Design a protein around this ligand. Structure first.
Ligand SMILES: *[C@@H]1O[C@H](CO)[C@@H](O[C@@H]2O[C@H](CO)[C@@H](O)[C@H](O)[C@H]2NC(C)=O)[C@H](O)[C@H]1NC(C)=O
Ligand SMILES: CCCCCCCCCCCCCCCCCC(=O)O
Ligand SMILES: *[C@@H]1O[C@H](CO)[C@@H](O)[C@H](O)[C@H]1NC(C)=O
Lengths: 49, 49
């Protein structure tokens, strides 16, 4: 006989959403992994993606 | 320096009624902790671990 604490009142999620930026192009995998010429290791090439 | 002598006494001829405060703590706040919401709040994998 008495009063007992329990877990706090939980509310479960109803659905899942995904928010990504409006991006259409594919990344240059052919330009990076299938390039005709590759740089030397002392002058390694850095490309911004 | 109390004027001590072997045959001298000091006797009050009047009085003062004095009221003073004393402040005592009695209780503090009762707190409860949900462990799952503190450590692993709304995460099922953390609760399973
Ligand atoms: C005992 O002490 C009280 C309190 O200090 C004295 O009462 C005061 O007496 C003076 C002079 O008569 C008055 O101006 C004050 O208004 C009195 N104060 C209060 C609160 O009544 C009292 O006279 C003292 N008695 C003796 C015999 O010394
Ligand atoms: C053209 C480069 C695009 C840059 C993308 C950076 C984001 C990181 C995602 C991973 C991309 C490379 C994954 C390599 C694929 C390995 C496949 C395999 O195991 O055979
Ligand atoms: C890689 O480059 C070569 C030479 O340009 C080409 O023949 C080949 O089709 C390319 N492969 C891909 C997957 O782009």
């Amino acid at each position: 006989k008495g009063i007992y604490q329990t877990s706090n009142f939980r509310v479960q999620p109803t659905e899942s959403i995904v928010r990504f930026p409006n991006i259409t192009n594919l990344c240059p995998f052919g330009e990076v992994f299938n390039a005709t010429r590759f740089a030397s290791v002392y002058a390694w090439n850095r490309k911004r993606i | 320096s109390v004027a001590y002598s072997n045959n001298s006494i000091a006797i009050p001829t009047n009085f003062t009624i004095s009221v003073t405060t004393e402040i005592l703590p009695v209780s503090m706040t009762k707190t409860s902790v949900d462990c799952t919401m503190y450590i692993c709040g709304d995460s099922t994998e953390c609760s399973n671990l």
